[PDB]
Paper text:
The E. coli 50S large ribosomal subunit is composed of 33 proteins (L-proteins), one 23S and one 5S rRNA. The 23S rRNA consists of six architectural domains that, stabilized by the L-proteins, define the shape of the 50S subunit with its three protuberances. Here, we present a biochemical and cryo-EM based analysis of the earliest period of 50S assembly, utilizing an in vitro reconstitution system with purified rRNA and L-protein components. Taken together, early 50S assembly occurs in a domain-wise fashion, while late 50S assembly proceeds incrementally.
To differentiate states occurring during late assembly, emerging structural features such as the central protuberance, or helix 68 were added to their names (C-CP, or C-CP-H68). Late 50S assembly, apart from core-stabilizing incorporation of uL2, involves stable binding of bL9 and bL28 in state C-CP_L28, which stabilizes the base of the L1 stalk.
Residue numbers in the entry:
A (entry chain V): 1 to 94
B (entry chain O): 2 to 117
C (entry chain F): 1 to 177
D (entry chain W): 13 to 81
Amino acid sequence: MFTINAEVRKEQGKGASRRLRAANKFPAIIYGGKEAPLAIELDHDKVMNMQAKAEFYSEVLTIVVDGKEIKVKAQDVQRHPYKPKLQHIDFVRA
Amino acid sequence: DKKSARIRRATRARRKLQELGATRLVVHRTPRHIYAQVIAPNGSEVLVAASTVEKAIAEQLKYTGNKDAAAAVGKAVAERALEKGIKDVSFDRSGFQYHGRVQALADAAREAGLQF
Amino acid sequence: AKLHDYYKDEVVKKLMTEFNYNSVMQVPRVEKITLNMGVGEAIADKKLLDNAAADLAAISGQKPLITKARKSVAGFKIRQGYPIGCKVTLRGERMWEFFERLITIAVPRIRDFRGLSAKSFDGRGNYSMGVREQIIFPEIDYDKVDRVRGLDITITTTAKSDEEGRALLAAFDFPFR
Amino acid sequence: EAKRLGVKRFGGESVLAGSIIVRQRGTKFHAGANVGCGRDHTLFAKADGKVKFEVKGPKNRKFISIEAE
RNA sequence: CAACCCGAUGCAAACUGCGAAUACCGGAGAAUGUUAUCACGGGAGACACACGGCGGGUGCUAACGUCCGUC
RNA sequence: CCUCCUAAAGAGUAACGGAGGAGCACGAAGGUUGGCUAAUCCUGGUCGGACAUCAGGAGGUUAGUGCAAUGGCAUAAGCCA
RNA sequence: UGCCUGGCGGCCGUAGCGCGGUGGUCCCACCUGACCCCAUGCCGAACUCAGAAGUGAAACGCCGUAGCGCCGAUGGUAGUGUGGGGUCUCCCCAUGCGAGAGUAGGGAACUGCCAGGCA
């Protein structure tokens, strides 16, 4: 029922994370199962609008990446110390 | 505990002999049975071993464990070792007291034609 | 021996019957007895310690070993390595005969005999109490009595629970609390 | 005076008999094969070869060993 | 009102269950460098250095202050 | 003379910069062989005040390891013969 | 040789701790006496002399339990070498190396030699 937009990820490192954050975006990861964990790039404001929902804590997220629908869940979220910005997120293929 | 104390007492000689790196004959004792082996310098291989529980050496013994049994086991170990060609092993009494059956078997091994 | 055979004959039978034990040796078995003398006045004089040790040796089958200081405390003014008392470690025929002789006559003939305590246990079935007026014992005659002195009596048993101590007291018939 | 401390010779470095590997005030390392501890808790080689460091024991004690060439 | 005490709540130039990058030492390897490396011998000169960047001691985390290791 | 910082995960590295001990000692407090293993709390205890020592449980070196300190010491470098 | 048990190495909290269960075929443990091998700062305390009297109980071997505890990614974060910029107490930029904690996941370990019994 919930819509999610995802884009491929190809760069790794602190510099890459800085570039993503400066571009009004940020990275996230999906891990779990025998399938290889992988990173996915997400934007900042639209993903914040998604996370604003209060039912996220008990909802399975439907990631649409590379024309494929994957059911995952976010066990942990990395949040900026005090500023209201998200720099990284964790997901598991539930 | 008794086994732990015996092992830790033996540990001194057990670790000291490793630096020397020579073949070592050890004997484990128990009123029920007496076992013996000739461990190689690596500490994981043995050229010969005997056990009173096995009848091959306990057929002539009135019981598996006794002073005569220890002497016979020591003699058998020494003669098997001599025929195998140990070439001057060293001695280790499994951290026991050298006053009884261990002493008897050690003397039997010495008189069997050994030089330790 | 004299008490050991009777113990194995009847105490073991009653204990196994009441505790429906399956193993033969699950019934409690006594390890030893300890008869210590921790008066604490030995600092005042050393001759009293020697006399009490001789008395313990006479009553028992062996001479007690002396016990030295454990930890010094400034307040009480006690040093290290200074003997204060001694203990007899009764084991074997000696403990058997001594305990038999005690339980025969000594225990019944005590003033203010309110009965021994069955709740006072260390926590693993060892009964360790203290009793004064050593004159209760027969071996301490008026000829050799020096002063009314206390003692500590403990029974060391292979049991690991207080139920076993209670069962042993029942076997001894435990006159009353 | 500033007394010298530290590992004189590290792992993988050739040593000769009578050469001190690590001069330590206490016992932070223990001799293994062809290594000896002096009266002053100094580790010295008893042969010629390469030096190696390992960790073993109940307390994860560090052992210095020597392998001949 | 308040010890020991569970959660903690702050600090440690002489705290570490854990724990970097740099700096030092050993081995192997392509490449470049007029051997740029070491030993011996002859000859010296200098023996109040100044300023600035980097991370600090100190000063009142005021001063073009004070002293460190490196450049 | 020695121990710890300033002193920047090698050593060393300055200030009338920052904190401390000693001129010792053993013929046993050394060696060898065989054995053993703390401070700390609770339980009962004429004397016992919680704070002489005593028998049992845990604890696992916070004890001790001669001097001030540092690093090590349980295989003990600590204790007995 | 398939299993249980014991001895000799490695590895040193994946081997550890708590809890439930199982074990005497072999092995191991338990026992009295000890005047004899050996000894008590008393004690047969420990070791040693006889073996099973019988048991598998304290202890010990083993199975289950992911309870405690332990190990622990990818990623991200703090940090930092190099050159530069700024509003130069400190931050950022391009670039290289990268934490710890925690998540996923792992696991009730595994392994070399010899001996007894159960086939």
